[PDB]
Design a protein around this ligand. Sequence first.
Ligand SMILES: *Cc1c(COP(=O)(O)O)cnc(C)c1O
Ligand SMILES: *Cc1c(COP(=O)(O)O)cnc(C)c1O
Lengths: 359, 359
Amino acid sequence: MQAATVVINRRALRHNLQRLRELAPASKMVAVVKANAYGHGLLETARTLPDADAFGVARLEEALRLRAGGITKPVLLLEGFFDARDLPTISAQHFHTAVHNEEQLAALEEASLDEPVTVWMKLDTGMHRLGVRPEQAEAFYHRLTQCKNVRQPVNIVSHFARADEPKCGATEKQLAIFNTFCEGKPGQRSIAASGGILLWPQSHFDWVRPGIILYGVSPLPDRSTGADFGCQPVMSLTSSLIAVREHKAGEPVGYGGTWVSERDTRLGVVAMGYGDGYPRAAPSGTPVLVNGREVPIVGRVAMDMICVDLGPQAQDKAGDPVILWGEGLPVERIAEMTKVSAYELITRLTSRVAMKYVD
Amino acid sequence: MQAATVVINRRALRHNLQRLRELAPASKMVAVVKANAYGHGLLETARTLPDADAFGVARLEEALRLRAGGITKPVLLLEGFFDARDLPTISAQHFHTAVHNEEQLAALEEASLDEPVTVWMKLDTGMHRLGVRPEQAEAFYHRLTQCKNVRQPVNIVSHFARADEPKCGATEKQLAIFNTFCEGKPGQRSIAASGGILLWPQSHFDWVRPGIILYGVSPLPDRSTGADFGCQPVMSLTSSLIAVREHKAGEPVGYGGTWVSERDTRLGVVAMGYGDGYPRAAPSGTPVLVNGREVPIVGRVAMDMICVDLGPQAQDKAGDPVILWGEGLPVERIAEMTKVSAYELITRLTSRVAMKYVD
Ligand SMILES: *Cc1c(COP(=O)(O)O)cnc(C)c1O
Ligand SMILES: *Cc1c(COP(=O)(O)O)cnc(C)c1O
């Protein structure tokens, strides 16, 4: 039988990269593949997009894992390097890096490399997470153009904190700061991720960094799905029923007796739980497809199982196909119902989930 | 590594198995290691406990993975087998199985195996998740004693739905039903997991199945910890700071501008996010240890990073040790602050977290 499985549509992945090129026609693409390509799988997602101009990762470990799998294209270390002793590898592996601190800068200044490295100075334009603040940036920037170990020109990168909230002036302010600092400087500019790409065409510049929407999922907090932008969903979280049992009115289900039935019915048990990555927070009523028909989750989600209400004469049987989200049921619909971010839903899955690739 | 890492204390693990033998002195132990041993590591956790009477898993795949690693004790398939074509492997691998449906029973009835298999009839005593209902149990049970494919005697297993709620009578009702069915029967009895073991000594019977408490974490939802029962915490979710930046009063942090500072201060950025398994639901103020000193999380938890408030003048720096939960900080405290179950915190982690084993 088949249990917890993530089916990845390679065809939809391809379609989305091309669709994003159409929406951002004058910008190169940094396919962001951090966290195991967003739960889709880091090396397979890269191999599915040999057309990507570059790949973005959070950590050096992820980039090296790409190189190990035979990925040859430029990989961008979005958070830079955490140890100065890593520069020689970064240089030799032809990894491009962000530089946000003095550790990183002072290291590049005194390292001894056999080749210089391509760098993207991270500028803090409002997110206040990583990056050099405006009033320290000019001096920091100038030191990078003097590094014999940095390939010139120095590129400039930044990130939006609230691009999915078009009504507040957060984005327009970050853009204002970004634009002021880049005036008169050569080198590529990049500040847009999924939100900036879809809602802010002024922020496309030279390179855009699609992450979530690359997988056909909307980065927005409203009811929108990847299909709202012509992007197709890549992931399908699937499983199977391991039991179909009789149940009676007044009887509770699961831990804590969270749900009590008002009628005699039949309950289905799914080989899926939070030990696989399915949200334990999922409330009774959350939709799940059984034999391509939507049924509600009843009772608390356990570590390995989920119960659903099928109906008194429901003819579903142990072994039948279940879809937690995918074709027929967008992950955005599960996010709305469970109140869990689609970003976390597709990404916080465990190694217990099998991986399938189609097309 | 210096980033996302889970450190597993093998010596605390052994201490807990024997501490549990002291709490349930007349019962054998079924070490429950399903879902990658609750995030601690399926095969390493088994190898650390060669003293366990048996190992419990959710799925067949997990049991096979144990045999592949050289684990030889008896392994109990807590949910049984999902396909009749699996009986031959299960018989040959000497896996013990639960039997809750007719598909499983009919499979045993007509299979041809070189050896009979040890079975635990799963009885639904109130949880209404898996198991044969009371009114169908006697006939179902009798068919199992007539199998030459089943090693006699037929053992009886069940599970509590609310053992962590001593004030509702649910547990005494399940126990009442369990006891009535076992009257006059010749096999082993088992109904207690972590809660039943600690709060209900009349449910210990022949075998107890410690899961969460085996890892030194309390099953109950009140604020007690594993140390309340003499059990030592096995897991430590650790990482490092990748940046220490200046921040000013009135300035927000992270996505959505969730947190705004009322002083000038210094922010630390941790190489930890929900792409690793850390709850994106963690509210500002949640505790983190930086250099063995507690600091609050400020702003939204991102996929790869977490910001903390260090103070205006604070001497922490990129590279310094961070503890998300562990030595200075029980996962139960993080569960309270996060309102996320300790079961899910330690279990729903991703494959990007490195694994260390000490002692
Ligand atoms: C992860 C990340 C991205 C992608 O963002 P999405 O909203 O998922 O598209 C792009 N850039 C940086 C700096 C990131 O850390
Ligand atoms: C997983 C499980 C356990 C162990 O539960 P804990 O609450 O962690 O003690 C024991 N028995 C069964 C039937 C289970 O599914």
